[PDB]
């Protein structure tokens, strides 16, 4: 948890958002937070 | 000891009702949805 | 022969789409029968 | 534009969000707005 959070990058979350919505090359700034939440939860689940 | 039955009945009511209400109203719906969506989809992919 | 192969691939795609649609209909709550069963579940639990 | 906007439903946007993220049965409330934007743009493009 500590390492992943302290190494979090906004650009990775934006890249995830762009992947999640193929039919658009731009993602709203808010999508950064959503993808951050989902990425954190998913990686933590895999470790579990 | 039979004389104290009503008071212990009320005590058990107070202790248990919140537990059951919370569990049933919060978790079970999400648990069922998650189990179904995480079990069926891979099976559908393997069938395809 | 190639048309048969095309048809098989399209069949697989269609089956995946149908299963996803059904599961997500259940998740959203649009499945009225499932909602009836779940409310019966909750009522039975509280009554018990 | 007028008809689609006046007939917009939050539940459809939430359903789109749930579809966009298969590995989770819940979508953050914010995803409603994002999927609304994307749905509007996509349908308008198809009409165009």
CA distance B3 to B15: 20
Task: Write b or e for each residue in D12-32: b if 16 or more Cβ atoms lie within 10 A of its Cβ, otherwise e.
Answer: ebbbbbbeebeebbebbeebb
Method used to solve the structure = cryo-EM
CA distance A31 to A15: 10
CA distance C15 to C6: 14
Which residues lie closer than 8 Å to B40 by C-beta, 6 or more apart?
C19, C23
The angstrom resolution of this structure is: 3.7
CA distance D13 to D31: 8
Per DSSP, chain B holds a count of helices (H) and strands (E) of 1, 0
Which is nearest to D43 in space by CA: D24, D30, D3, D18? Answer: D3
CA distance A33 to chain D (A): 10
CA distance D26 to chain C (A): 9
The string of DSSP codes covering A7-45 is T--HHHHHHHHHHH-TT-S---TTHHHHHHHHHHHHHHH
Q: Does C10 touch chain D (CB under 8 A)?
A: no
């Amino acid at each position: 948890l500590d390492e992943l959070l302290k190494t979090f990058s906004v650009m990775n979350a934006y890249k995830r958002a762009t992947e999640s919505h193929p039919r658009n090359s731009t993602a709203p700034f808010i999508a950064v937070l959503v993808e951050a939440l989902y990425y954190l939860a998913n990686e933590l689940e895999d470790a579990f | 000891i039979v004389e104290a039955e009503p008071a212990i009945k009320e005590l058990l009511k107070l202790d248990f009702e919140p537990k059951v209400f919370n569990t049933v109203r919060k978790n079970f719906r999400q648990t069922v949805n998650n189990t179904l969506k995480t079990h069926l989809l891979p099976m559908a992919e393997e069938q395809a | 022969l190639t048309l048969l192969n095309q048809e098989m691939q399209n069949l697989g795609i269609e089956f995946k789409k149908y299963m996803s649609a059904q599961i997500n209909d259940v998740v959203i709550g649009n499945d009225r029968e499932f909602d009836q069963d779940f409310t019966k579940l909750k009522a039975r639990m509280v009554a018990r």
